[PDB]
Design a protein that fits this description.
heterooctamer; A mainly beta (about 15); B mainly beta (about 130); C mainly beta (about 130); A: about 15 residues; mainly beta; B: mainly beta; 11 strands; about 0% helix; binds methyl alpha-D-glucopyranoside; binds methyl alpha-D-galactopyranoside; sugar binding protein; Beta-prism-I fold
Chain lengths: ~15, ~130, ~130, ~20, ~15, ~130, ~130, ~15
């Protein structure tokens, strides 16, 4: 779809 | 606060943060590894001063973070990250800050933390982590 | 307790667990998606009985878990998982069990939970999650 | 390496294992 | 995204 | 031909295919590993018969495919996969079929083949491979 | 020749190579994307001159490589990469060099090329590609 | 496991 590589991202922790 | 997003890299070599024993985490900067070469991430600074700086220099690549934990809580009416602790396969760094509020922890069985994003105003508002094999 | 490791699959369709409002989580079983077809994982059961069964049927694939949270704490001298909550992009399932002890939460910004592993004796001793894009 | 595929694994939460 | 895991896929080799 | 898509698995344990030295590859079936246990994939059969069966049993998990190569070319008016060769870290299986036409090869320095998809009519029209770490 | 390894990045923005209509590919240099910012890779130059330069400027991130193909063959006793062709979702760049020898091609159904490594003496001896989601 | 991230690598094509 996009030419940008993706990565798993976890979070966020802190203010919503 | 002011948002930031370092993106993803090959690994972590050094973490530079600052804190205050009465409030929370302040500045945050990471020196990543980019395909074998150190890559200095932008220094994400607090709007204020008075923090105690800390430098976590990892023995890259043999040493790496296995768990990140900390506390989030209210400070002057703002929910922020009050404390952070980094545990590697070799040592435990921290806790830095105040361990009061709601704890959180991210242990990693397989994989690596390869990037950070979040927001910092007076203190670290929130943050997320990029994970990869 | 007896360790288990379901491994990684391509998605999650249904979660079956049991709890006791005075102790902790007991049984744990998952129906995974395996390349478009349902795959029934083994039922991991507690060494004892008396738990309340709960079935979480997700509207796969449009509905998926975005955050897992819960509490760990001491029960009978053992540290176990006392409560679990599953938040999807459509609804919140739980909390199931006793919301007492040390909280933990895993929000996912990008990625998917595709497997579980852990250990169960009288109760769920601990658990981990496989993550993938 | 081995012929077994791997994936990121986070945890565990609960009793300590490491 | 959807609730289905992704994997790198190379190919196809053979007929167009 | 009739398209098929086995999806992604944990690894490869055995490959069962058939071929005709004067035409091309016919039947194709794979026994995958699914989190430590064998998973028999669907047998993708040619519309016709008269092929020579071949069983490639790998010493999973110590043995794995490092390179897949072969040839594509016409059989009557259709472009198909005429020949295949599988090279592991222990042995070379093949070539099977007509070793003439347009060559193709996929050497893997890091990673594993964890699935197959393609199409089969009288012969294997085309195929793709799933790759993972 | 002199080996090189650019490593892995977030994507590809521009490829700069040179070739000679009678021999093979010479110089090779890539401008990668690193978390949204251009990152200029080291120029990997041939030991000799006389090549014709080519600049492939991609419309990142909407345009990306979908297939890389080429030819390998003997040049003055050395097996090298004689030709390269890059096909994106928007157009075809090449072939550049000499389309003679043994062909090879890597079509990608899902995923992205995020880095290159190889070796260059008088000509490009060989090369590999990093793939990722 | 080392602290260096890994990615799938295909090839090489050319001289052995
Ligand atoms: C005191 O106010 C400042 O610090 C807080 C906490 O860091 C931020 O949330 C806020 O946006 C910023 O303006
Ligand atoms: C001879 O025709 C048959 O075989 C070819 C080659 O496998 C298929 O492409 C085609 O759909 C099928 O009908
Ligand atoms: C003519 O010799 C030079 O060029 C060839 C082909 O590029 C390299 O393989 C070799 O190492 C280098 O010394
Ligand atoms: C009551 O003992 C049993 O349950 C606890 C808590 O689940 C532990 O798993 C322990 O190893 C098991 O023998």
């Amino acid at each position: 779809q996009s030419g940008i590589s993706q990565t798993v991202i976890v979070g966020p922790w802190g203010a919503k | 606060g002011k948002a930031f997003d370092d993106g993803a890299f090959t690994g972590i070599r050094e973490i530079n943060l600052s804190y205050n024993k009465e409030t929370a985490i302040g500045d945050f900067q990471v020196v990543y590894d980019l395909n074998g070469s150190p890559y200095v991430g932008q220094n994400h600074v607090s709007f204020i001063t008075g923090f105690t700086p800390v430098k976590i220099s990892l023995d890259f690549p043999s040493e790496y973070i296995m768990e990140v934990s900390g506390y989030t809580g209210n400070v002057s009416g703002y929910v922020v990250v009050r404390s952070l602790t980094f545990k590697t396969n070799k040592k435990t760094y921290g806790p830095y800050g105040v361990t009061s509020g709601t704890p959180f922890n991210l242990p990693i069985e397989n994989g690596l933390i390869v990037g950070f994003k979040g927001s910092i105003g007076y203190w670290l508002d929130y943050f997320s982590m990029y994970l990869s094999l």
